Amino acid sequence: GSHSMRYFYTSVSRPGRGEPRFIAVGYVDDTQFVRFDSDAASQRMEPRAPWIEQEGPEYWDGETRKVKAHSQTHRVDLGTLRGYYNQSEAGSHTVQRMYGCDVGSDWRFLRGYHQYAYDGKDYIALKEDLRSWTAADMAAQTTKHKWEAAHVAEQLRAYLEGTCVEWLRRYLENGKETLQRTDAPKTHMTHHAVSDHEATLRCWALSFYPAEITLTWQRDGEDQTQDTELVETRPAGDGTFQKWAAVVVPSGQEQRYTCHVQHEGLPKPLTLRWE
């Protein structure tokens, strides 16, 4: 299928004492594979998936150097953003950066992205074409003009369409046994007698990967949205994901209702029915 590599950076200023917190995590699809945390002891990019441990010392040295360099750019950003917004040095603020690339089921480049936020709001992002910037406000516009002058977009576009894609493919090959494995949901339905006259049917999807899934209820073959609840997809903690969807039904009428499960690991959608 389609695949992605993404990095997520979070930098939070510590006005009380010392340097900002900086945490970087890297993902291939829904699998975290590296982390760097400024507060940790190693001061190294660390592995978080077994297949990345295939890489040797030059890789780890190189990733550590780059991620520490990015962390210093973010440290300078916090200061600069405080000035832009005329903010006091007393308060903590947050910067986030997310970037990466998608390839299609043929592993060709599809799309790249680089976005940057300040205090939880859009600040500046590359547009879909990777050739220009969107700036949310006049502070971000100042940045935009700076980065236009530096011709940042051109170097970033080269990374996203080039390096990012090549290394994604490398990882997908090296981690093939899990990264290219689809884990269809293990599904079952439970039944919770809610009162004398109503029952709740809960359709579970467990231990799936990747995280994308659709759970839908129908009654008599049509979509049921009334009296349903659908929880946010959540990590199991072993690398797989969980979700459920529930509907409240009149007791005795459970058979009209069907839960429909769509997932990349399923040859065709599953249908579950309480009988």
Partner: peptide, 10 residues
């Protein structure tokens, strides 16, 4: 694999 240190500050 990270991009090199070409991100400028804002």
């Amino acid at each position: 694999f990270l991009p090199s240190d070409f991100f400028p500050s804002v």
